Design an enzyme around this catalytic site. Structure first.
Site, PDB file in Angstrom:
ATOM      1  NE  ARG A  63      -2.596   3.335   1.628  1.00 42.47           N
ATOM      2  CZ  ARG A  63      -2.304   4.733   1.714  1.00 42.47           C
ATOM      3  NH1 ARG A  63      -1.137   5.099   1.783  1.00 42.47           N
ATOM      4  NH2 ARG A  63      -3.375   5.579   1.586  1.00 42.47           N
ATOM      5  CB  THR A  64       3.369   2.585   2.531  1.00 43.75           C
ATOM      6  OG1 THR A  64       2.184   2.705   3.396  1.00 43.75           O
ATOM      7  CG2 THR A  64       4.395   3.812   2.588  1.00 43.75           C
ATOM      8  CE  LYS A 120      16.987  -3.958   8.951  1.00 40.26           C
ATOM      9  NZ  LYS A 120      15.933  -4.227   9.847  1.00 40.26           N
ATOM     10  NE  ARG A 165       5.541  -0.003   6.482  1.00 43.71           N
ATOM     11  CZ  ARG A 165       4.280   0.866   6.948  1.00 43.71           C
ATOM     12  NH1 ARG A 165       4.215   1.935   6.391  1.00 43.71           N
ATOM     13  NH2 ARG A 165       3.349   0.058   7.460  1.00 43.71           N
ATOM     14  CG  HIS A 225       3.063   6.650   8.648  1.00 42.56           C
ATOM     15  ND1 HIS A 225       3.939   6.686   7.514  1.00 42.56           N
ATOM     16  CD2 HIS A 225       2.048   5.794   8.144  1.00 42.56           C
ATOM     17  CE1 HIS A 225       3.474   6.041   6.616  1.00 42.56           C
ATOM     18  NE2 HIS A 225       2.303   5.563   6.771  1.00 42.56           N
TER      19      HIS A 225
END
Ligand SMILES: [Zn+2]
Ligand SMILES: [Zn+2]
Lengths: 134, 304, 303, 134, 303, 303
Positions: free
Chosen positions: B54-55, B78, B99, B128
């Site tokens: 979506r973003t 990570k 993000r 955000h």
């Protein structure tokens, strides 16, 4: 520089958190004295006001004089700073700060009975008791 | 230089009121007059450490609509530190939209990106800002202003990053009346309320939307995640915080319904037909809000 | 360019003269951008083995030359033959950058891509030419040359594709003395040493970095994967093959530290402050080495 | 008890690793002194021979005197113990010791240039230099 | 005579005090004098639709301690249940089952015929076997279940264990309850109304030190980090962990209990103290579960 | 038995006299069954690291002594501490057989199991005593003794927990000559060789099996994991460390072939016909070695 009227079980804490024994100068320490206070004496080294301020959270009502010139050169009590870095840990486990090679940083502000510490990274506010508990 | 040139976009608290007006104005101008090649020869990194289609689509479309080139990744759920990763990427590209599932990562990026600006596409529960800028630009377009408005916020106000940022941002404008409509276990936090009190801003709590429907200019629905309560309490309480077309009889003609998206049960599909439905146009305005932000950050002189 | 429409598969396949061309073009593209040299070109970023580190660098180079990119990064699973895949893709695009988990795959692509050039982004253990080219361009830019240099290579020399390729490439230059610093179980293989002896190139073994730090121009750290021994044997011996900032007192002023990345424990973060840290600038030079490589293969004239 | 001729930057190490500042007695410390040397002195507290042995890896050529009887009662140098517990960490990351609430334990034995430390749990041997690096 | 023979054990609301007294008594008797072959030639189904090794091991150990044979399964983390129970009830003599959907053990009852169904928890709804072992532990350590000071700490909003335990203790006399939990995880209202409608004393408290002097049972629960955000967790967690230094005011008879597993709730220095009884609590699980099985599969238990 | 209620964790912990006891009891239990020696006993089969090969053998031994079994085999994932887990389980059962992916875990269990004995089914790289005990019992049964034997050990001697334990155990017997047949990168470690030198035990290195085949009584094949080198280096050198039936012409008539299992490429299937194949009988002897071990720990009197 000499630090007077350190609370009990805060002298070794200050030496550890502020890495005072990571030098080559003459250092002298004393714990549990008449007042149960503690005392740190280190030769030929100057602390700025910020480093004295950084002692406020751990040793609030303490005194910091200078005696490297064989006389009481300067007077100094620790005032509360706006920022405290490199010693505190973020209680928020998901804070990016933990894994990464950055320095922890918290903004300081006084409340009633409390001191709010807002993290620079996760932007979360905590009572100093929670930050110092861990 | 405009006041945002070569600055990072991390938090809504970092953006001043003067700054917000600039972004909104630039969004409307880019919307009215396209600038398809404003960012030619620019390469932007779409770094979605936490995947969000979506973003990402909205961000990357805005990037392309200004003629910019795109590189990126979307990791699934990570070893290399984020500092090392961004220190590397900042040598490749000209801007970093990222993000991340850990709070403060966009801020940590800032300290290792050099002069490559870092835009936050949400860093977990903290910030955000692009969503809030997207929300504001939509409110401004539909109400003509951001001041003296009656704004209702419904859903999960305790864990909704979108509504905390949006309430904070509207508190930088004047004469706004706030209505918080949420169950007790998901109430608006205290740190938001005192902030409203410290600026003498009027706000009230309400058990249902029925109380406020007559005098609202913005109805802001949030996604009530079922996981935050037990399915029992959810089913018990959900009825007071959904929106059916039948609930819009007294609503004002100028009033709009907003939703960050996606909607599950909050908004019944009969609302889509009503003229108060603006959640899709809201998402569509995301292109311009993020278009403006990218343009303002990567050029000094914006022929607006 | 004598490399026009030729594939970039192995470092043995590149002549010394060829390496000089790529380095020169890299420096030229770096100094003066050429954003539209490969406009209207479509390059396939075919990462059969996913590698975000490598893909971002390649695709940025592609876009920095105004080219469009299509590709994929497959997930870890081990249907359509690789021959069939390249036969199909070579009809879509003008160049194929590919990374594959099986050795010799980029070579196999060559035999089914026709005149569509194939660039190797590493086929498991044998070759990884673009990594070596960026390494060279970085060494050359920081030392002013690739000849008569003191180059130390530290870490996992037995399984490092990066260092075998880099040693071979530097062995095509003159008067270079090599220092291999690795534990015995991860020593430089025999075929590399014989290759150095057959060209009368000086090389020596060392147990630690302290021995050589004074007289090195390049310190090349590699990632010692903990999996190659049991965690105990790793922990016992690893201390001699990590790098702390305190070890850089006698180091030469011109000397640079290099690392393919990612670094785990090998390089302590106190090196980042020192001016010897060049592993990030090394990665940044990857863009220009790969810009040059793409340009040479898809254009004749230095515009 | 008084400790003389502590190596450089090992005094604060001994206080930290052995939690010596976790008492109410009078403690006095000095680092970077004439030999530089260090000094740790704590009033009305005696450490047994095993506890003195635990300093052998950190302060090899040191002296331990006593000042609870208003005179230098005994002289004593630290001999190497058979086991060293609660201070060392196992370099083997897969060792069960790390996650769990047990006490670290290593058996000690001399080599020519090296000192072997065998962990009690994973039964693996390390050089004392490797154990003390982490 | 034995109102639990061939009856199902689904909810703690379904068990009367008279029933609870019988189960407790049988547990104590089986503990003192084993009955290793009390359930010989019996076949019990250990049906863990939702896997739980902690619970399955304890249950199946109880089964074997009475000489019964065991068959079962543990499904991974992701045919109607009616059909399943209709089939299994033809195989076995008793069904111990854990299911991720509320009310499933009840649904089994309606399709098991004369095969009794024991609930090993149906998600948020019920978990009677845990409460019965909790009771037997409190009774053994305090000598009684009446006129006790019982504190319940942790996640009281989502703890199925504490709702059942409060409900069950409310069928005994003169118990004073102390609920120590953050406001967002407070004891629900319907539990408090239940206490008021029986005139049972209860109070709220912010920390354990507030009440430590006047408690006979301190019942720690696991505050799952997922129920709050890690930030809100960190702010409030300090008031609901337990270190040995907090046990200076504790009464000599006081015991610490915990359903398990403990993460941060109980510091490990408590294990040495004589107030640590959470492992003995788990150990009592077999006897509570031995008793439950025995009472259900025999008409005459000659003890 | 001097091993009653003691844990079986490491092969260094077992004295020579102890090994003789287990071997004798294994032979006795094998010759005359004792199906109910551990009746009414409940043993925990705790395979934190799943191993069907090992679990089946252990649980069969448990059942062959009429004991009941409860346990689990966790899936590959890397909450509750191991200390807490054993503290809980040790309240349920009478003995704990456990396999763990972290070294020293069975030792950690000992410190929290109280007087509940803990048997090690291997804690990753260090110890695996039951495998060595079955190996010994097999060597002893087929050779009539464990002294003055010619024992060859082939394969991955660097990372083989099985062969390090077996070499140490045979080094407690007299006049044994060892032949180590392994590639250089997987050689027998130094600490094993020094251990043999400190007892004046004869040992030699060999490049292939052909050198030693004539004068060996035990041929002990191990699984060379292909992962320890790149598939190329494996394929290049592996040929000298596999075993074909054609290699058994000069072998002694009493000689047996042994293998921990599973065999991949190491042992060609033509050996199965020969009378030298004893790797399956070796696995079968695992039952008796583990029956004896359980009995000695849970019973004093040889019934
Ligand atoms: Zn933080
Ligand atoms: Zn260890």
């Amino acid at each position: 520089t000499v630090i007077d009227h350190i609370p009990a079980q805060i002298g070794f804490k200050l030496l550890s958190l502020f890495k005072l024994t990571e030098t080559d100068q003459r250092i002298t320490i004393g714990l549990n004295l008449p007042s149960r206070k503690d005392l740190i004496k280190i030769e030929n080294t100057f602390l700025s006001e910020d480093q004295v301020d950084q002692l406020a959270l751990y040793a609030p009502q303490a005194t910091v004089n200078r005696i490297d010139n064989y006389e009481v050169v300067g007077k100094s009590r620790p005032s509360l700073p706006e920022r405290i870095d490199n010693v505190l840990v973020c209680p928020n486990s998901n804070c990016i700060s933990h894994a990464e090679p950055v320095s922890s940083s918290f903004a300081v502000r006084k409340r009633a009975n409390d001191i709010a510490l807002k993290c620079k990274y996760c932007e979360k506010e905590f009572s100093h008791n929670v930050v110092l508990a861990n | 230089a405009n006041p945002l040139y070569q600055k990072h976009i991390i938090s809504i608290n970092d953006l001043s009121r003067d700054d917000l007006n600039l972004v909104l104005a630039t969004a409307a101008k880019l919307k009215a007059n396209p600038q398809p090649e404003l960012l030619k020869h620019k390469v932007i990194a779409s770094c979605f450490f936490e995947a969000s289609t979506r973003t990402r689509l909205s961000f990357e479309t805005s990037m392309h609509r200004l003629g910019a080139s795109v590189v990126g990744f979307s990791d699934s759920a990570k070893g290399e530190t984020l500092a090392d990763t961004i220190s590397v990427i900042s040598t490749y590209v000209d801007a970093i939209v990222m993000r991340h599932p850990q709070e403060g990562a966009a801020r940590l990026a800032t300290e290792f990106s050099g002069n490559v600006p870092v835009l936050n596409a949400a860093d977990a529960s903290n910030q955000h800002p692009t969503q809030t800028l997207l929300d504001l630009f939509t409110i401004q377009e539909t109400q003509g202003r951001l001041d003296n408005l009656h704004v209702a916020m419904v859903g999960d106000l305790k864990y909704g990053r979108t509504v905390h940022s949006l309430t904070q941002a509207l508190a930088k404008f004047d004469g706004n009346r706030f209505y918080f409509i949420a169950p007790d276990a998901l109430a608006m936090p205290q740190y938001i309320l005192d902030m409203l009190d410290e600026k003498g801003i009027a706000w009230s709590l309400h058990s249902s939307i029925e109380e406020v429907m007559a005098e609202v200019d913005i109805l802001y629905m949030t996604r009530v995640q079922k996981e935050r309560l037990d399915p029992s309490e959810y089913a018990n309480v959900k009825a007071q915080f959904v929106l059916r077309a039948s609930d819009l009889h007294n609503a004002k003609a100028n009033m709009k319904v907003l939703h960050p998206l996606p909607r599950v049960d909050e908004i019944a599909t009969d609302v889509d037909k009503t003229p108060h439905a603006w959640y899709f146009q809201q998402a569509g305005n995301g292109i311009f809000a993020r278009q403006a932000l990218l343009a303002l950050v990567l050029n000094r002189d914006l022929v607006l």
